[PDB]
Amino acid sequence: NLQNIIYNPVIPYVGTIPDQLDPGTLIVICGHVPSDADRFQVDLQNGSSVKPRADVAFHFNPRFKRAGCIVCNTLINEKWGREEITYDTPFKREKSFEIVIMVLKDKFQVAVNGKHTLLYGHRIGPEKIDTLGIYGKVNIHSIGFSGPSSG
Numbered sequence: 773n774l775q776n777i778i779y780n781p782v783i784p785y786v787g788t789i790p791d792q793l794d795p796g797t798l799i800v801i802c803g804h805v806p807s808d809a810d811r812f813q814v815d816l817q818n819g820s821s822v823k824p825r826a827d828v829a830f831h832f833n834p835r836f837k838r839a840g841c842i843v844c845n846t847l848i849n850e851k852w853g854r855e856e857i858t859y860d861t862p863f864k865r866e867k868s869f870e871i872v873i874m875v876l877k878d879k880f881q882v883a884v885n886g887k888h889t890l891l892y893g894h895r896i897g898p899e900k901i902d903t904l905g906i907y908g909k910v911n912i913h914s915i916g917f918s919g920p921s922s923g
Contacts (some may be wrong), residue, residue, distance in 0.1 A: 774800055776918025781915065783812075785906040786820050789917070793898050796920025799873040803912040805865050811835045812908030814871065818900045825850050826903065829896035830880055832873070833861045846895040858890045866881075 776790040791797070793816070801814060813833040819826040828847035835841050842858040862884040863869060874881045879893045906912055 774918055775922070776917050778915040779913070781906070783906055783908070783910060783912060785904075785912065785915075787904055787915075788820075789902055789904050791917065791919060792832075793875040793901050794920055795875060795877040798918040799855075799871075799875070799904070800916045800918065801871040801906070801912060802869070802914045803871075803910055804868045805834075805836070806909050806911055807866055809836050809865050809909040811837075812906070812910030814873075815905040815907070816873075816901045817903040818896065819907055820903050820905075826894060827900075828905075829894070829901050830892060831875075832871075832892075833880065835859060836863070836865060840864070842890065844890065845850075848896065848919055851881045853895060853918050856890075856892060860889075862887060862889060873901065879905045 778787065788851050811833060813831060815828045816830040824870045831845045831847060833843040835843060840861045842861050844856045846853045870885055872883045875898055879891050881891055882889045
């Protein structure tokens with residue numbers, strides 16, 4: 773099963789990731805989108821500093837207004853980079869979801885509810901990631917991790 777599981781965390785959630793995100797590592801997040809959701813985000817960060825705001829290696833941001841979409845980006849020295857938008861979003865208000873982020877050597881691969889959703893190339897060395905943050909309107913049931921050599 774998954775390791776270092778966290779159940780029913782209070783949002784906003786900011787926690788240290790147990791192990792380095794070496795290639796093949798999986799981050800599994802199960803939750804539900806509340807009725808009043810406009811957006812929420814899963815951020816893989818370098819630290820937990822609020823001021824100055826810690827760099828966000830990978831910002832996964834589902835948005836629900838209108839047709840909906842998913843915005844991905846990177847924050848470095850408090851400045852957002854170029855956004856990468858996915859218009860084919862599997863998320864929707866009042867529906868449960870399972871997000872699986874697989875950290876590969878050159879990029880992140882994200883699947884939602886068992887379906888491939890998007891790729892995001894590394895802009896910050898993944899070894900610099902040590903914190904997981906979840907913010908916005910989202911209800912998280914569980915957070916779990918799986919190492920590449922797990923068995």
